[PDB]
Amino acid sequence: MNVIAILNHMGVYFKEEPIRELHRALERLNFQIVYPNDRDDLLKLIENNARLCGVIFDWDKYNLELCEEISKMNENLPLYAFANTYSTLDVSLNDLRLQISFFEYALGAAEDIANKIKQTTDEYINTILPPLTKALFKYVREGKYTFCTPGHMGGTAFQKSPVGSLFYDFFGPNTMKSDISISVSELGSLLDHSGPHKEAEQYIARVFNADRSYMVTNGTSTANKIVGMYSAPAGSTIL
Amino acid sequence: MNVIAILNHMGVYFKEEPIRELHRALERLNFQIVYPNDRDDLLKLIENNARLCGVIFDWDKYNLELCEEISKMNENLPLYAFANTYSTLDVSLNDLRLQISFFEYALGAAEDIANKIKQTTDEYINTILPPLTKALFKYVREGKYTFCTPGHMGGTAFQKSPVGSLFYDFFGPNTMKSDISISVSELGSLLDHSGPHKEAEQYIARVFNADRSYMVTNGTSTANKIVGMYSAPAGSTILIDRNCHKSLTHLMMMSDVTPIYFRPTRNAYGILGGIPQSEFQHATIAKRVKETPNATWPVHAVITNSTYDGLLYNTDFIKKTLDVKSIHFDSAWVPYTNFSPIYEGKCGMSGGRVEGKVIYETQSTHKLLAAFSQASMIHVKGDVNEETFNEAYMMHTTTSPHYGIVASTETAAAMMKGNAGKRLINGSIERAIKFRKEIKRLRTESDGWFFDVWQPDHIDTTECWPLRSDSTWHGFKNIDNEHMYLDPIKVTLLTPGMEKDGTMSDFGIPASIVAKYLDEHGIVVEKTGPYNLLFLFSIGIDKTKALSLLRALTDFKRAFDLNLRVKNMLPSLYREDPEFYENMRIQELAQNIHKLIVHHNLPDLMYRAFEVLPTMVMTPYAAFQKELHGMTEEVYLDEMVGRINANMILPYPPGVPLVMPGEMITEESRPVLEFLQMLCEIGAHYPGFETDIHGAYRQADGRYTVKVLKE
Amino acid sequence: MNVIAILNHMGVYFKEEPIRELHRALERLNFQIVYPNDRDDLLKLIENNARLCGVIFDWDKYNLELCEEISKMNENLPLYAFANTYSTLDVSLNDLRLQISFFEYALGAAEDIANKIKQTTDEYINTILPPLTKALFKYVREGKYTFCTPGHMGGTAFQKSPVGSLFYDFFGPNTMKSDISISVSELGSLLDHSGPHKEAEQYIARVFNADRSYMVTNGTSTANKIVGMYSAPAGSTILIDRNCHKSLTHLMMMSDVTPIYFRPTRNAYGILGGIPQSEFQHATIAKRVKETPNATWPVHAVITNSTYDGLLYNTDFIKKTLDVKSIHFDSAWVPYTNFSPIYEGKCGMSGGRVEGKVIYETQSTHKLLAAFSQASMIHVKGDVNEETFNEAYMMHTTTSPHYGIVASTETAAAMMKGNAGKRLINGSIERAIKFRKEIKRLRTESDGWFFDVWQPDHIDTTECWPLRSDSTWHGFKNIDNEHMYLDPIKVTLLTPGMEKDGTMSDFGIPASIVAKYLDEHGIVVEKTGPYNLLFLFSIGIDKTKALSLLRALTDFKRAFDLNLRVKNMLPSLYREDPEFYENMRIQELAQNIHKLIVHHNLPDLMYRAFEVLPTMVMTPYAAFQKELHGMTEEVYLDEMVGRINANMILPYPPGVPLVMPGEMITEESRPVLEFLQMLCEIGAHYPGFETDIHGAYRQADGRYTVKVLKE
Ligand SMILES: *Cc1c(COP(=O)(O)O)cnc(C)c1O
Ligand SMILES: *Cc1c(COP(=O)(O)O)cnc(C)c1O
Ligand SMILES: *Cc1c(COP(=O)(O)O)cnc(C)c1O
């Protein structure tokens, strides 16, 4: 997730020069820059490419041809449209879910714009991800809780055995660090149904239209036997 | 400041080759080179980009299309125009302030041209900056004076402590070196009023049209106490306005004076109007003198122009009818009524010197300008004693002023002179009027309810809209004509909830709910409460911050029409009480609060609690003296009829004082006490909307207690 | 803060290879790598270099030589010690605050180690900083709030004007972004005393040993007015010291109180001592009450501890003999009498809570510490009312404080906490005692006259030298034992010119000539005049600024013994009058001024003028009321016997008040007027050394005029 789109070329210099200054500032924080062509070019960069999170275009050029087609696909994609002096909204742009970030064409302030894009991108990551997954990714980058199960502890024992180094370098460092048990306080437990695990049951049942949705960790073949041991008395009758 | 512009391309080689040689010479001295396109390209590099100082163009190509448009934006802007053999000036280029530097197209002399541009740029910096700020910047680069105050001495002690290195590296090396005191000879002292500080006081008064002006380093709240302690002896009489600030109340509590409160006008939405013209008469002021025990002739008058909302007065009528030798205008919200033709004769500085009188103003600096906090001014228009007024200024200013704020106080005045400063006031007005038209355009075309702007039906003109007597938008009963004006930059948004006659309605959304939604995206509401919203459109609000407010208003209608949840809209309000705000939606909360306003009747109790002034027993100065002795007690809110309060009641909403410290609530001020008991019931059922009254302490049962004086 | 230290070299390859791999990984996250030599090399990288936060060393090599010396300086300093297989702790390493992070020498895992160092470094930053400063740094990096105050909003308006870009590019981007008001929820408000501002009052009072410490944002001159406006009702009685500051005089002119002036001790050199122990008795205070009309029992006492020269008193005797429920200590020059064992029982905060009394102190911040200007504190030691004292603090502090100074006020209290902060107090004392020994060493070994330090004959000890009764260095006649102390960091250089008995000599150089000579190299004398030179040896004076002062003193003896010209020695004085100072040398100017002091008799006319007290007719508050009406006139200096003055006379030298506003010069105070007429004659012959008296206006003939009240 580091693709920034810069659509259209006004042909002037006071608008393209800030783009050239921003081109060298976004690459310092690991971000790919793409230059789409016409309106149909930007539409192909959203359905096909899924690692996009930034769309830069002139607000006084396509204010109704881009704010409608993008909202039908991704209703939370951060838009980095650049407005002008005589810029305004439209009456047909009220019932659309968008995230437009306005800016200007000022020289020297390209460094401050790069910090706002990185902060806005972090807000999009924290929104599309559930709170249970957010706690797992944050524990890897921020988490030094030792003396906890499992025994590998993010792949510590694999760095001592020669055969264990081949199994740790196959998946990745972030793979073994995300394999933790219920030995963490800020993540709760699955059997306790509290904390992040409590909000996960309400987030799945609401989207899938249900009242109480669980998470079976042994496939469907095991989940069928859980229901069968609830409404089947001894010597009764099942269909 | 290192941007050099090279406009156009002649196509020839004897003119473009010196440009290529100069391109490699200017980069050696840290200068950015830009290549604009046509004539409209260079015009966009001045209004948007402010770090530009060099314009290179052919003189025999655009000698009239560039020398006129640039002169309308900046006067001292250097113009590095290249002339030819058959080149001359124009008759239409005599009354224009420009700085044209001629050169040639000689090869090999590109190094000598770069030295001339660097010196010209240095002369531009030493000219547009005031001598006080210029001497401060030169002292940092050239200044090795030791054994001086403060103790940090440019950040010397911070390099020895491990924790001090994090605080020094945050601001910068040039930040701590500029924080010096009066231990410098070539910069003078602020209390001495000599040297660079003497020329700075005469420069600020010339920009803001005044005779003498000081630099208060403790905000406007302190500047109001310096003037009040100059024309109000012990046992005199002052004419302070009712809509006073928290600092203005302390002025009455620190001086043994007998104030006379006025009766400003107001409507039903809570918008503070103004003082009628009948209160400024001679028979009206003299009538309240005999009725008030221990009161002589008023020798000072305090007028809050403008108020907290943003409604100017008419100084052309006050300076002639009001017979007060010391008239004060608390200009804590209009530090710009000078550099615009639609603001002539609206403030105290606009006009001439009034004989036998004097005008005082406390223009705020860190409010609607661009400077550090705790900065104010004292504008004096008249003939006052210099040896007497100087002693009153030292009673509120320390002997070691912070030059980091003093340099910014004068900088805000230097940013206003010239065409580059006039476009900041007019630029904010054009962006404000444009935002006013975007609301009326998205109101009729929309399908449903929409926000409204407290403005007349005709806003095509570009001036202050007068509050006439044949209009229905202001809603003021019996208002004086040509006395109350409207501030264009002070856009007052009205939320649907009330009618045009002052009653209520079935469908309505309070302004307190919208204020919480704006804080989520990052919008701070200045004033909120019943059905009104206030925003600040100063010179710092550019086109990005202005358009960000309209998008947040359109998103509130979408989330309300679709009936969303509180958790999926207001995450900050959900964290206050997740149990109560669980199964509650955005339409259930907006309708339950609206029914409480109609049931408790807010517009009627608020309008009748501010007009009837409570009986003032003693002076506000005597109320604070009894508190220091220890004769104070805490009683309940329902048990206080006939007692003398100790503090000032500042209920939110709105934001005006209710009972002054020293008054008594008798049988005449009955609706005054009913306003306090009404807010305690409406602000106790739903979390997040608690009652906010400065003076009422919350206990453990819900009943608020106030501090009164013992009998 | 990005210095990582790697000590020693094992010589093996399995330990040095991970060091080289980590060298290429730490540089990717901006970190400086250093390689010290032996054990003494690492110790020099902590005291001198404060930007260090990482020490890498072998655990099985120096487990006891490094874990003890480092803990004595910085306790929270992270230690990246690398252990081995057979590694263990020590019994002598239990009572030491350390942060040891164990690692291995695994290849390829250098990337994971770099992430742990960056996370550990972030923990050190989020620990040594107070929560109020932590919220300010996080708001700059993370903050998207629009429509806030002030109008600049981190420098938005400065990017639109050409003159505004020069003021924004000087400080830095992070400077203007940290200047926000009380419009932020996650930072609280200063007037509300909640959130981060609530924990800041408990963090400063705990370190400085207090119960309620506030943050004044207008210097010490304003904090003294808040204390006086709390325990001094109208028509009461206060015990203010005679050697009061300019702000302390205005406190008496703003409150209708009856002050009682003391009679501190003094010598002939101009160094004022302190209040004797006989003035604190019950028979002395009650005697002046009956003699002074309209005066009751004193309820507040203002004690200047220490004075302007730096002389500590004895609080162990005042808190028991002085029967005042509100004893104030003006600690504007000793913000460190707590972090050293040689300062116990010398201030009001040292010790416990006095039964029935309260201690109020206004310790300065931008005087002898490291913070922005206009910063002070209010220390409360006792059981007082919180709701009553809160109203007095809001009468001098604006509603929109400057967080750039508030963050620096609490930072000064955090830079002194811990052993890393205590080394700055003890380090400044060791550098001060060393400077005192260098003067006596260069005095006897030299050939001729040399400067002298006002210190006892025995300075081998490291403590405050008491002023005994059997000594001749202090010169105070009839002084109380164990009452007056000496500040070691307050070195007073006594220039030759007077004897040890109080009379005059034949060969000497006044201190006024030396004061201007030090300014040529960049040294400003704090206090000069007769034959004294006061300096400040705070934490800002490092080993470079201390040694530079002695070198400038040795150059004055060389230029005076060789008899040089004024033009080739004092170029600043020569530019004032090149015609008069043409054929004049350094010996002719030094001998002519010395004869004028003996002729006019300065020590006798100064010791007798400041000793007696003029007849106080009315209170200082009533003197300012008559000035506002306009009954003030300007009379000559020779025509004022029997009149009432309006301003305070502050003659230079020395720098202490002479006549308070509201007193009368009759037949008893005859030497008082003789001191003013003597300075008008000695300061008129030679330019540059003119008479400097705050209150006397210079005319066109030479005679100074003062402002008195009309009869
Ligand atoms: C495939 C299948 C299963 C097994 O699914 P798993 O998730 O692998 O356990 C169970 N029931 C039915 C009807 C299936 O088709
Ligand atoms: C905001 C305001 C003040 C306080 O301004 P500061 O400069 O922060 O002291 C004082 N008076 C009025 C009328 C105000 O609106
Ligand atoms: C220097 C001084 C002051 C003034 O200090 P500021 O912080 O600049 O206001 C006040 N009182 C005393 C005793 C001083 O020495």
CSV table of C-alpha atoms in Angstrom, one decimal, chain B residues 1 46-52 74 124-125 128-129 133 136-137 140-141 144-153 156-172 174-176 178-181 183 185 192 217-222 225 229-234 245-246 250 253-256 366-374 385 387-388 391-392 394-405 407-408 411 414-415 420 424 519 521-526 535-543 545-546 548-549 621 624-625 627-629 632 634 647 694 697 707, chain C residues 1 46-52 74 124-125 128-129 133 136-137 140-141 144-153 156-172 174-176 178-181 183 185 192 217-222 225 229-234 245-246 250 253-256 366-374 385 387-388 391-392 394-405 407-408 411 414-415 420 424 431 519 521-526 535-543 545-546 549 621 624-625 627-629 632 634 647 694 697 707:
chain,number,residue,atom,x,y,z
B,1,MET,CA,13.3,33.7,0.3
B,46,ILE,CA,3.3,36.0,-6.4
B,47,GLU,CA,-0.1,35.5,-4.7
B,48,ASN,CA,0.5,31.9,-3.9
B,49,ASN,CA,4.3,31.7,-3.5
B,50,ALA,CA,5.6,34.3,-1.0
B,51,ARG,CA,9.3,33.3,-1.0
B,52,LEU,CA,9.9,35.0,-4.4
B,74,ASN,CA,4.0,44.4,-4.0
B,124,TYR,CA,15.1,44.0,0.4
B,125,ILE,CA,15.3,42.1,3.7
B,128,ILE,CA,10.6,45.5,4.6
B,129,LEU,CA,11.5,44.5,8.1
B,133,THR,CA,13.2,43.0,14.2
B,136,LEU,CA,17.3,41.1,16.6
B,137,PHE,CA,18.2,39.0,13.6
B,140,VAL,CA,22.0,36.4,16.6
B,141,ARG,CA,24.6,36.1,13.7
B,144,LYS,CA,29.1,37.3,21.5
B,145,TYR,CA,28.1,39.2,24.6
B,146,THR,CA,28.5,36.9,27.7
B,147,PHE,CA,27.3,37.3,31.3
B,148,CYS,CA,23.8,38.3,30.4
B,149,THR,CA,20.2,37.3,31.1
B,150,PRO,CA,18.4,34.9,30.7
B,151,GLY,CA,20.5,32.1,32.1
B,152,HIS,CA,20.2,29.9,29.0
B,153,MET,CA,22.2,32.4,26.9
B,156,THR,CA,24.1,26.9,26.6
B,157,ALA,CA,22.8,25.1,29.6
B,158,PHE,CA,20.7,22.8,27.4
B,159,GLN,CA,23.8,21.2,25.9
B,160,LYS,CA,24.9,19.9,29.3
B,161,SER,CA,21.7,18.1,30.5
B,162,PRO,CA,20.4,15.0,28.7
B,163,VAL,CA,16.8,16.1,29.0
B,164,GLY,CA,17.7,19.7,27.9
B,165,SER,CA,18.9,18.6,24.5
B,166,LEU,CA,15.5,17.4,23.5
B,167,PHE,CA,14.0,20.8,24.2
B,168,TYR,CA,16.7,22.8,22.4
B,169,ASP,CA,16.7,20.7,19.2
B,170,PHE,CA,12.9,21.1,18.9
B,171,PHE,CA,12.7,24.8,18.2
B,172,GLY,CA,16.1,25.5,16.7
B,174,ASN,CA,18.2,30.6,16.1
B,175,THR,CA,15.2,30.5,18.4
B,176,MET,CA,17.0,30.5,21.8
B,178,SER,CA,16.9,35.6,19.9
B,179,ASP,CA,15.4,35.3,23.4
B,180,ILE,CA,17.4,38.1,25.0
B,181,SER,CA,16.6,40.7,27.7
B,183,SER,CA,21.2,43.4,28.8
B,185,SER,CA,23.1,48.2,24.6
B,192,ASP,CA,13.1,53.0,28.9
B,217,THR,CA,3.4,41.2,26.3
B,218,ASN,CA,0.6,39.6,28.2
B,219,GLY,CA,-2.4,39.4,25.8
B,220,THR,CA,-5.4,41.7,25.6
B,221,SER,CA,-6.6,40.7,29.0
B,222,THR,CA,-3.7,42.7,30.6
B,225,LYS,CA,-6.2,46.9,33.0
B,229,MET,CA,-6.3,52.3,35.9
B,230,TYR,CA,-5.5,55.6,34.2
B,231,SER,CA,-8.9,57.5,34.0
B,232,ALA,CA,-10.7,56.0,37.0
B,233,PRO,CA,-9.5,57.3,40.4
B,234,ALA,CA,-10.6,55.7,43.7
B,245,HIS,CA,-14.8,40.0,29.2
B,246,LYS,CA,-13.5,38.0,32.2
B,250,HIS,CA,-11.4,42.0,37.3
B,253,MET,CA,-12.7,44.3,41.3
B,254,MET,CA,-9.2,45.9,41.6
B,255,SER,CA,-10.2,49.6,41.6
B,256,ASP,CA,-12.6,51.3,44.0
B,366,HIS,CA,-2.6,36.6,18.7
B,367,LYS,CA,-6.3,36.4,17.8
B,368,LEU,CA,-6.9,37.1,14.2
B,369,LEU,CA,-3.4,37.9,12.9
B,370,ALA,CA,-0.1,36.0,12.8
B,371,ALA,CA,2.2,36.3,15.9
B,372,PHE,CA,3.1,34.6,19.1
B,373,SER,CA,0.7,34.4,22.0
B,374,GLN,CA,0.4,37.0,24.7
B,385,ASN,CA,0.4,63.0,29.8
B,387,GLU,CA,5.0,61.1,32.4
B,388,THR,CA,1.7,59.8,34.0
B,391,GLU,CA,3.8,54.7,35.2
B,392,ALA,CA,0.6,52.8,34.6
B,394,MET,CA,5.0,49.5,34.2
B,395,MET,CA,2.5,48.3,36.7
B,396,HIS,CA,1.5,45.4,34.4
B,397,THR,CA,4.7,44.7,32.4
B,398,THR,CA,7.8,42.9,33.7
B,399,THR,CA,11.3,44.5,33.5
B,400,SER,CA,12.6,41.6,31.3
B,401,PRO,CA,10.3,41.5,28.2
B,402,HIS,CA,10.4,38.5,25.9
B,403,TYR,CA,11.7,39.8,22.7
B,404,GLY,CA,10.6,36.7,20.8
B,405,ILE,CA,7.0,38.0,21.2
B,407,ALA,CA,9.4,41.1,17.5
B,408,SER,CA,6.3,39.3,16.4
B,411,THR,CA,5.9,42.1,12.6
B,414,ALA,CA,4.7,45.4,9.2
B,415,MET,CA,2.8,42.7,7.3
B,420,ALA,CA,1.0,42.8,0.0
B,424,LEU,CA,-4.8,39.9,3.2
B,519,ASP,CA,-14.3,18.3,16.2
B,521,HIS,CA,-12.6,15.7,11.5
B,522,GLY,CA,-10.6,18.6,13.0
B,523,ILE,CA,-12.7,21.7,13.2
B,524,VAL,CA,-12.8,23.8,16.4
B,525,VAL,CA,-16.0,25.7,17.0
B,526,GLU,CA,-15.6,29.2,18.4
B,535,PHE,CA,-16.2,30.8,13.0
B,536,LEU,CA,-13.1,32.9,12.5
B,537,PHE,CA,-12.1,33.9,9.0
B,538,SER,CA,-9.0,35.9,9.6
B,539,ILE,CA,-6.0,36.3,7.2
B,540,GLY,CA,-4.6,32.9,8.2
B,541,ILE,CA,-7.7,31.1,6.9
B,542,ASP,CA,-6.7,30.3,3.3
B,543,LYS,CA,-8.7,28.7,0.5
B,545,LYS,CA,-9.3,25.9,5.4
B,546,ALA,CA,-12.4,27.7,4.0
B,548,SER,CA,-12.9,22.2,4.5
B,549,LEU,CA,-15.9,23.6,6.4
B,621,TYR,CA,-14.3,46.2,44.5
B,624,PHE,CA,-13.5,41.0,46.6
B,625,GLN,CA,-12.2,42.6,49.8
B,627,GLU,CA,-13.5,37.4,50.4
B,628,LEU,CA,-9.9,37.8,51.6
B,629,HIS,CA,-11.1,38.2,55.2
B,632,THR,CA,-17.6,33.4,52.5
B,634,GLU,CA,-21.1,27.8,50.0
B,647,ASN,CA,-17.9,35.4,41.9
B,694,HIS,CA,-18.2,29.3,35.5
B,697,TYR,CA,-19.5,23.8,41.7
B,707,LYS,CA,-20.1,30.9,46.9
C,1,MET,CA,19.7,12.6,20.7
C,46,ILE,CA,28.4,11.6,29.2
C,47,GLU,CA,29.2,14.8,31.2
C,48,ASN,CA,30.4,16.7,28.2
C,49,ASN,CA,28.1,15.1,25.6
C,50,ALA,CA,24.5,15.2,26.7
C,51,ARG,CA,23.1,13.9,23.4
C,52,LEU,CA,24.1,10.3,24.1
C,74,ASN,CA,22.3,9.4,34.6
C,124,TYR,CA,13.8,7.2,27.3
C,125,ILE,CA,12.3,10.3,25.6
C,128,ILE,CA,12.4,12.1,31.2
C,129,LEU,CA,10.0,14.6,29.7
C,133,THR,CA,5.8,18.9,27.3
C,136,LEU,CA,3.1,19.6,23.0
C,137,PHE,CA,5.6,17.5,21.0
C,140,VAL,CA,3.0,19.0,16.4
C,141,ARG,CA,3.7,15.7,14.7
C,144,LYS,CA,-5.0,18.2,12.0
C,145,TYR,CA,-7.3,20.7,13.8
C,146,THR,CA,-8.5,23.6,11.8
C,147,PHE,CA,-10.2,26.9,12.8
C,148,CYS,CA,-8.1,27.4,15.9
C,149,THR,CA,-6.3,30.2,17.7
C,150,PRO,CA,-4.0,32.0,17.0
C,151,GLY,CA,-4.6,33.0,13.4
C,152,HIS,CA,-1.2,31.9,12.2
C,153,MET,CA,-1.9,28.2,13.1
C,156,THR,CA,-0.1,29.5,7.6
C,157,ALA,CA,-0.5,33.2,7.2
C,158,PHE,CA,3.3,33.7,7.0
C,159,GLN,CA,3.4,31.7,3.7
C,160,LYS,CA,1.2,34.2,2.0
C,161,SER,CA,3.1,37.5,2.5
C,162,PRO,CA,6.7,38.2,1.3
C,163,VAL,CA,7.6,39.9,4.5
C,164,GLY,CA,6.1,37.1,6.6
C,165,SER,CA,8.2,34.4,5.1
C,166,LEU,CA,11.4,35.9,6.6
C,167,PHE,CA,10.0,35.7,10.1
C,168,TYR,CA,8.8,32.0,9.7
C,169,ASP,CA,12.1,30.8,8.1
C,170,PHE,CA,14.2,32.2,11.0
C,171,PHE,CA,12.9,30.1,13.9
C,172,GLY,CA,11.7,26.9,12.4
C,174,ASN,CA,8.3,23.2,14.8
C,175,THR,CA,8.4,26.6,16.5
C,176,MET,CA,5.2,28.1,15.3
C,178,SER,CA,3.9,24.6,19.2
C,179,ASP,CA,2.2,28.0,19.8
C,180,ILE,CA,-1.4,27.0,20.5
C,181,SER,CA,-4.0,28.2,22.9
C,183,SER,CA,-8.7,25.4,22.3
C,185,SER,CA,-9.1,19.1,24.4
C,192,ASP,CA,-9.1,25.4,34.4
C,217,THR,CA,3.7,33.7,32.3
C,218,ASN,CA,4.8,37.4,32.9
C,219,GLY,CA,8.1,37.1,34.8
C,220,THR,CA,8.8,37.5,38.5
C,221,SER,CA,7.6,41.2,38.5
C,222,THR,CA,4.0,40.0,38.1
C,225,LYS,CA,1.8,41.3,42.8
C,229,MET,CA,-3.2,40.9,46.6
C,230,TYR,CA,-4.3,38.0,48.8
C,231,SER,CA,-3.1,38.7,52.4
C,232,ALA,CA,-3.4,42.5,52.5
C,233,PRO,CA,-6.9,43.9,52.9
C,234,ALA,CA,-7.8,47.6,52.4
C,245,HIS,CA,12.2,45.8,43.5
C,246,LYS,CA,10.5,48.2,41.1
C,250,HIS,CA,3.9,49.3,42.4
C,253,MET,CA,0.6,51.9,44.9
C,254,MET,CA,-2.2,49.5,43.8
C,255,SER,CA,-3.5,48.4,47.2
C,256,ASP,CA,-4.7,50.7,50.0
C,366,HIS,CA,14.5,33.1,33.2
C,367,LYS,CA,17.1,34.5,35.6
C,368,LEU,CA,19.6,31.8,36.6
C,369,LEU,CA,18.2,28.7,34.9
C,370,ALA,CA,17.4,27.8,31.3
C,371,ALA,CA,14.0,28.8,29.9
C,372,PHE,CA,12.2,31.4,27.9
C,373,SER,CA,11.7,34.9,29.3
C,374,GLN,CA,8.6,36.0,31.3
C,385,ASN,CA,-8.0,28.3,50.4
C,387,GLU,CA,-11.1,28.8,45.5
C,388,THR,CA,-10.0,32.1,47.0
C,391,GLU,CA,-9.4,34.3,41.7
C,392,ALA,CA,-6.3,36.4,42.4
C,394,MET,CA,-6.6,35.2,37.0
C,395,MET,CA,-6.3,38.9,37.7
C,396,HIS,CA,-2.8,38.9,36.2
C,397,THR,CA,-2.8,36.0,33.7
C,398,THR,CA,-4.4,36.2,30.3
C,399,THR,CA,-7.0,33.6,29.1
C,400,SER,CA,-4.7,32.5,26.2
C,401,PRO,CA,-1.3,31.6,27.7
C,402,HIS,CA,1.8,31.0,25.5
C,403,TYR,CA,2.6,27.3,25.7
C,404,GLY,CA,6.1,27.9,24.4
C,405,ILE,CA,7.0,29.5,27.7
C,407,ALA,CA,6.6,24.2,28.5
C,408,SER,CA,10.0,25.8,29.3
C,411,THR,CA,11.3,22.0,31.8
C,414,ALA,CA,12.7,18.6,35.1
C,415,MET,CA,16.3,19.5,34.1
C,420,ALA,CA,22.1,14.3,36.3
C,424,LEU,CA,24.7,21.4,37.4
C,431,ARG,CA,33.6,26.5,39.0
C,519,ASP,CA,31.8,45.3,27.2
C,521,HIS,CA,35.0,41.8,24.4
C,522,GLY,CA,31.4,40.8,25.3
C,523,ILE,CA,31.1,41.0,29.1
C,524,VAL,CA,28.3,43.0,30.7
C,525,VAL,CA,28.7,43.8,34.4
C,526,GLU,CA,25.5,43.0,36.4
C,535,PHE,CA,28.6,38.7,38.2
C,536,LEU,CA,26.3,35.6,37.8
C,537,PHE,CA,27.7,32.1,37.9
C,538,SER,CA,24.6,30.1,37.1
C,539,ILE,CA,24.3,26.9,35.1
C,540,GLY,CA,24.6,28.8,31.8
C,541,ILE,CA,28.2,29.8,32.7
C,542,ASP,CA,30.2,26.7,31.6
C,543,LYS,CA,34.0,26.3,31.8
C,545,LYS,CA,32.5,31.4,29.9
C,546,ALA,CA,34.2,31.3,33.3
C,549,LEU,CA,36.3,36.4,32.4
C,621,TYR,CA,-1.7,54.1,47.3
C,624,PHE,CA,-1.0,57.5,42.7
C,625,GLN,CA,-4.6,58.7,43.1
C,627,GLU,CA,-1.5,61.9,40.0
C,628,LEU,CA,-4.5,60.6,38.0
C,629,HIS,CA,-6.4,63.8,38.7
C,632,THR,CA,1.3,67.2,39.6
C,634,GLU,CA,7.7,69.7,37.9
C,647,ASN,CA,7.8,58.6,41.7
C,694,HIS,CA,15.2,56.9,37.6
C,697,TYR,CA,14.5,64.5,34.2
C,707,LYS,CA,7.7,65.5,39.6
